[PDB]
Amino acid sequence: PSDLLVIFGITGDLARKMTFRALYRLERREELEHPIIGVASDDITLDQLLDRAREAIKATGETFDDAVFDRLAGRLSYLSGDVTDTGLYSELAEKIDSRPLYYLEMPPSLFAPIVENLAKADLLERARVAVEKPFGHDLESARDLNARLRAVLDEDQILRVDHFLGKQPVEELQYLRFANNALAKLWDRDSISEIHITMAEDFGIEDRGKFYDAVGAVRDVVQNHLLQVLALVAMEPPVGAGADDLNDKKAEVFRAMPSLDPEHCVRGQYRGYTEVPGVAKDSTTETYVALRTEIDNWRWAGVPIFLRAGKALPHKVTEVRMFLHHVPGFSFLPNRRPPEPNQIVLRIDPDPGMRLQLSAQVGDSWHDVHLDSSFRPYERLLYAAFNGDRQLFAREDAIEETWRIVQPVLDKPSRIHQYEQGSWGPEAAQALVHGRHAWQQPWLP
Amino acid sequence: SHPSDLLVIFGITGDLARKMTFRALYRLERREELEHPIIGVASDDITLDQLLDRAREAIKATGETFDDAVFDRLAGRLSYLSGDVTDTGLYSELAEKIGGDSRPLYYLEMPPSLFAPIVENLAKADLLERARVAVEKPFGHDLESARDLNARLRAVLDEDQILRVDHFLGKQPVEELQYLRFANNALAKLWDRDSISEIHITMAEDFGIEDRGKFYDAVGAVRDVVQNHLLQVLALVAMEPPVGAGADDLNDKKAEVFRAMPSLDPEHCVRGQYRGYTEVPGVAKDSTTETYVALRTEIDNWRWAGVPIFLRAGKALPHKVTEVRMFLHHVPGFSFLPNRRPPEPNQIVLRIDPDPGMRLQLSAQVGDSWHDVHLDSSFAVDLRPYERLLYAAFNGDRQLFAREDAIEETWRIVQPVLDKPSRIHQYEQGSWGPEAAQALVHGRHAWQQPWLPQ
Amino acid sequence: HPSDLLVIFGITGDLARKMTFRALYRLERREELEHPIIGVASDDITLDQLLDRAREAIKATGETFDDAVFDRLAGRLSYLSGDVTDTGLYSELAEKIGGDSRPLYYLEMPPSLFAPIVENLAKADLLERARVAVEKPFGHDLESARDLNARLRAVLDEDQILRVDHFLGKQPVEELQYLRFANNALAKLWDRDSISEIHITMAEDFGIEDRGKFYDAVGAVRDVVQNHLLQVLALVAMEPPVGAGADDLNDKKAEVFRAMPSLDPEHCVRGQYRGYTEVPGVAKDSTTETYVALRTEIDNWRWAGVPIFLRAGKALPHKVTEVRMFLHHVPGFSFLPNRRPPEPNQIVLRIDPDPGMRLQLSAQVGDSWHDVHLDSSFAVDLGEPVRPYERLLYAAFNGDRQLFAREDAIEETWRIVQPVLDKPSRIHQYEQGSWGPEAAQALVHGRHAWQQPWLPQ
Amino acid sequence: HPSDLLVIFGITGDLARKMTFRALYRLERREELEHPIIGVASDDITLDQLLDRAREAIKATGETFDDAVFDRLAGRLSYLSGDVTDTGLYSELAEKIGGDSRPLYYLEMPPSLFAPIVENLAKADLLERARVAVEKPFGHDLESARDLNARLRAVLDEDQILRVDHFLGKQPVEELQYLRFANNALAKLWDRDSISEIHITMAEDFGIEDRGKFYDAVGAVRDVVQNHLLQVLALVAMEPPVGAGADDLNDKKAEVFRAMPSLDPEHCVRGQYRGYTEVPGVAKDSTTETYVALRTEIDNWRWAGVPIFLRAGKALPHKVTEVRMFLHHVPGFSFLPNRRPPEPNQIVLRIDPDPGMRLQLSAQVGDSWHDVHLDSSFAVDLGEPVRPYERLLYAAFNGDRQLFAREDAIEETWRIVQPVLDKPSRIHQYEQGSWGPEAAQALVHGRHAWQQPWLPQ
Ligand SMILES: [Cl-]
Ligand SMILES: [Cl-]
Ligand SMILES: [Cl-]
Ligand SMILES: [Cl-]
Ligand SMILES: [Cl-]
């Protein structure tokens, strides 16, 4: 683990919205044990920064305790300067035998110049660098950024921070799959006919409309978050407990996926989106996407995978729903076939859990049976980054594969379908699954 | 193909009628399910009014809620005929009261030495053509006695007219367990030796021999629950799917199970007797009759070869529960990694009685804790068994009545233990039984705490 | 308990002349006849005249003739003349048959006479400890088979009834079970998770040489499909028996048929070879099929969704009966080269002649890929028609019922084929020596092409 | 991208004289050499003298000699004399080799010199577009392999390092993959649900013919098990690669080794053939093993619980390398006859020589049951030592890394074997021409007996 936290961009928006609060909460849980150096261009004093931190934490609605804050302030120092100027880094070198985590909450155009400067001042040897999203908007841009970082950093020093990944129950979903033989036996194409992934948020674009309008749902949730979720569900078991062992298995999944077919991709935009501040009146940007893909390997060949994600849907829920085949044969006999086949349902967020849907006879009635059980993201990622736990941080090979996968939809986007806020999305998403299993009502907490 | 339209009960003044039958008839009447006359037959020289009085007291004695209007409907259906079952005159009289237009169900609540004489007499008086005959347990106490009894009945009845009534079977969720296994692919995929490592069958009763000590002492736990009830349960759990929907299609599959089973090894059978058993009225002071049995068996076919099947059944155990517990193999491999192997493997648990259901036991991670997860559901109905059997018999539904070929295979299976019984081990009432039953499963899965109703 | 006396009704008829006399002669040569044989027919001839008939019949077949062997056979043979509908014949028979006898009655007579003979054997109290073997045909559809059967079962138990079908004598019943049930490399593959499709081919490279009138009333479906080929399918598809006896085996076969739906006539192609109508006894406008191709299925846990195609016919290019099982391709990896051969693996069972198994796989040698044929033999060659026939006669005499279809299977197979009998599709002509009508190719159009059968070397 | 220049350090040494010159000559005869070759050594000789030496070496091997072929080879060859620890050599080499060259540096040199040479190539800026092939050995244990490797990786990427092990040149890497991954009949069987046990046998029917002093410091475990045989096992056992490249293949092999526990020294039997101590260079009291038999396992989803027995040794009865996979018996039905052959089905892979596959099954013929051998060939014969060598050289030149173990696998295999190196079990003597020490029989007591290997016809 690191023993020093250095934050570039400590006076920016993300620091104000999330980072200061997250540091405060880690301090409250007594999980901060090391100094923190804030870096920015603002010509202010440490006391002014502390005032800014205090206000930012109180503004979030977090319960404020002065003793906790005073411990945090005691760890904090501030260094002002220009991130393109070697003098800043000479000064930084005086403040730093350390094992620093450099956390860059700065514009992406500055990631490379900062890292290149840290290198010139010999400040990377025992370091890691965490970069805030975005880290690319397509395959070529991600490759260019990545080439500049890798010129001075090993892959294992690079932590690509995506807040959605902080919601993933990575260890728990592995244990569910790999420690339970009743489930592991079912977890392939011989039992599973079809998979549906649903990511629904019951709110619109609340802020940063100008930023969202240049990103869109595909880049925002599909490329990294949802594909990573699919990989966790679909991957072969890792041969070890480390992060690279896990990332080896995820990359294998993506390598067996063909690139998306734009004709099997449906793009939606909620009515009212064009009136959000920062969004262009003629925007073609999607707030919803539904698509069909597949994993063409021994475990999953021929199993269609349908994915839908979108803003302003009826609920907040992320689900992976796996449909089993019916028991084969015996169409000529009664009482061998329920109206719907068995299903394994994984709620990823919120309140993660698993539901096994079966059918049962009671008297001369047959009915569905639900076998249910159970099994912050920002602070989790920050703590993990500091401790060098890379499980929640996508590795370069996966990034490049997932960009390859989504690129055709970015290059030839299909026409926008409008949908009402609070609906399940455009009707054209129903047509996607026409000869298959209908989109089901998601399992809610 | 047709239900019966007349119920004729031999032994209507006997103990089973008093303990169970009258109450069961009353409850069917309350549910408005009796639609036909009932003729009671016994040797007692009494009037119909006296019989009604007996019926009334018998029902009230059980603790059943008594409603006079319901009882009056039942009385309205009942007539009484007195005579001796070894006298030809009784059957001539019966022949005047029952026409060739009837479809009688003859229910014989009588000693088994009388089943053949009664049936042979019904035949001589031409009273069997549209009939079925339901015989109260016991119907044999070993392979030879069952074969002899059976040969005498089959001389005048087809197999499908013979209904062997065993109250324990009335508790079995036959349809529901089939649906569970054959209509749910998530379970069908697990239901073989590639996923299942071991099976434990537990039948516990939390009471001793409350009555009929002299009868039990001649029977014992093996004959009482294992030969018919528990082996029939096992067959339901283990059989291949029937290729038809009828009772005979079902019974063809059960029989195939038993034909792949070797006879029991008396050395792998542990026999117990609870302390205090010898003081039960009617029990001999030096009895070596077992009130508990634990055994090891197997089904040596493609589905189950190499899966050990352990069974235990007994009186005066800690709870009332009948379960089939199926242990899965662990997910194979990765012994060198933490958190791939829970302390116990997944299990499929079928509570047969009471309050039938299924529990799937899995393991889950929450934080840095790992714990058991219980995925529970109820199926079928809480069992009532006597009335269910009586109704089924009357309607000709033969699912809950063991067929002759199965009866003979199960007697073959248990016979060696009856011929050369192993020594009795004493155990305390309220314990799980003799410690020697623990040794049976040494090197395998420990006997688990059963899944009890909430 | 085997029989200890053989009684043959129809000893002067065509089957006796073509087959039965030769088969008895061969059993005598192998020293397998140990009991007297009573021939029965209407012809008013002496025993000597019968012996002359037997002698000529044997020599006519091309069998090597040894006069000492023939004399042993003649020594066992007696003859009884009369009308099989008259009680007097049976009184006479009752003198020749002792109260301690265990007769096999073998009826090589017209089928309209089976019931009258058996009913007469009953009236004369000659059926205790007997069995009765009846020559094909034993019904021409479900209703006619049920009627015949009801008349026999009124006086016989099922296990006294042996329905003789010479084709079944070719079936390697024990050896195919061993192949399937004793080899885990095969048993692991023998279900819908590995097998995508099954093709059954029965080809004969000859037309109708004799008895044209008889064939014209029967047709390929009744001749080979109803009993022979469906029985072969059942052997290939059944669950393993729980015991070694005939009834355990027949329980498993029946289960197969009970999970099969009746045939779809729209998926059935009927053929007739050019020249068939010029065969003596065949009507000039006959619509009787000498060829059939059809689709069926077995709708159970082992085989659901696996299409089963069957073709059988006269005047095809070769003599061969084959069961060809296609495996699925290894799934996945379409995006990679060299994971998928041009055809999937196959398991091929040659049933007749010269039974064997071929496993077809693919192999890489340099930058070449090619088919690999892993061939082996099992059982024994029963191609020459005499061998099956003698095997059945011997089995019947010894009470071995494995090669004789049981009543429940008979009725299920008639149910299965009935719709094709009731609504026969239009006849397609095909050339002798061809593989049959081109419409049989269309049957498998979205599936695996009919492959060249695996022939003996 | 293939290389376009071959630079051979050690061109006047023994390996060059025994193998390399001949291999270059053969590649030239097949018209597969297209680029210049620079020979480097300390000897103060001319190019002509080198050529004369090369000519004689080639003729000595028994290779058919054609002067026109040799002349083409000579036309490609230049010679540079100097000392590999002197910076002047590398300045000279830097003149001869342009900044646009793609050199393959082949080091047929003592291993203590690999790092100094590579470090000198780096100081002279000669590695940018290069690969470096190093002759075995490249370590004698985990620590020595890690140290060597650390020095190379300081200046080379892993993909510029080619670790040359002549045994690997015999491996039918593509063909064995095709066999497994394109045939569903085999892929269905290729896991612990069908396979009970695996035996790997590597037998050579000769002793230590040369370089006794070298072998006596190495031993069978280091010589054939650590790299060759474990790599063979990994090929047999691995999950399918997600691509056709070398790194995709090596990802799968590494995964196998990561699921293998380190060897148990108590389950390892070490042998030494009688006469070994009289081989020149071998110490009179040597405890170096010329034979090993061991037990291991792969503790993953595919193979957990399947014991893997391996045996390798010198002076055994035949030259053959085999992987023999025993299937489980068909389960159940112990109470019935004819459901269980005396031995279970087996899948047998002959790796070398004359690679092929045998599927052992059982068949019924009459009242006899017997073994059936379903044999076929795959790949090509690489038995003669020159072929594997030339194959490796060509592959190295073209940048095909499939036959070259990757660093992660090297380190896992050293971890696996290390306990046996640390605590070697007592030497058992065995006679030349025998199958080895009797203590190797005791290893498989309670499991499947060591079988007679499947030999080429
Ligand atoms: Cl389905
Ligand atoms: Cl286990
Ligand atoms: Cl005739
Ligand atoms: Cl085995
Ligand atoms: Cl050996």
Which chains share the greatest interface?
A: C-D, 49 and 50 residues
CATH architecture level-2 label of the largest domain in chain A: 2-Layer Sandwich
Radius of gyration of chain A (Å): 24 Å
CATH C-level of the largest domain in chain A: Alpha Beta
Quaternary assembly: homotetramer
The 3D shape of chain A can be described as elongated
List the helices and strands and how they pair.
4 copies of one chain form a homotetramer.
Chain A: E1 4-8, H1 13-28, E2 36-40, H2 46-59, H3 66-75, E3 76-80, H4 86-95, E4 100-104, H5 111-120, E5 128-132, H6 139-150, E6 158-161, H7 170-178, H8 181-184, E7 192-200, H9 209-213, H10 216-234, H11 243-255, E8 265-270, E9 288-293, E10 305-310, E11 317-324, E12 343-349, E13 353-362, E14 365-374, H12 377-386, H13 396-411, E15 416-419, H14 428-432
Parallel strand pairs in A: 1-2, 1-4, 2-3, 4-5, 5-6, 7-10, 8-15
Antiparallel strand pairs in A: 7-11, 8-9, 9-10, 11-12, 12-13, 13-14
One chloride ion binds at residues 435, 450, 452 of chain D.
Q: What would a concise description of this structure say?
A:
Four copies of one chain form a homotetramer. The first copy, chain A, has 445 residues and is of the alpha/beta class.
Describe the structure.
- Four copies of one chain form a homotetramer.
- Chain A has 445 residues and is α/β, with parallel strands linked by helices.
- Chain A has two domains: 1-161 and 376-394, Rossmann fold, CATH 3.40.50; 162-375 and 395-445, Dihydrodipicolinate Reductase, domain 2, CATH 3.30.360.10.
- Chain A has 14 helices and 15 strands.
- Chain A has helices at 13-28, 46-59, 66-75, 86-95, 111-120, 139-150, 170-178, 181-184, 209-213, 216-234, 243-255, 377-386, 396-411, 428-432; strands at 4-8, 36-40, 76-80, 100-104, 128-132, 158-161, 192-200, 265-270, 288-293, 305-310, 317-324, 343-349, 353-362, 365-374, 416-419.
- In chain A, helix 1 (13-28) packs across helix 2 (46-59), helix 1 crosses helix 12 and helix 6 (139-150) runs antiparallel to helix 13 (396-411).
- The two termini of chain A are 36 Å apart.
- Chains in contact: A-B, A-C, A-D, B-C, B-D, C-D.
- The structure holds chloride ion (CL) (5 copies).
- One chloride ion (CL) binds at residues 13-14 of chain C.
- The site of one chloride ion has 2 residues of chain C, from loops.
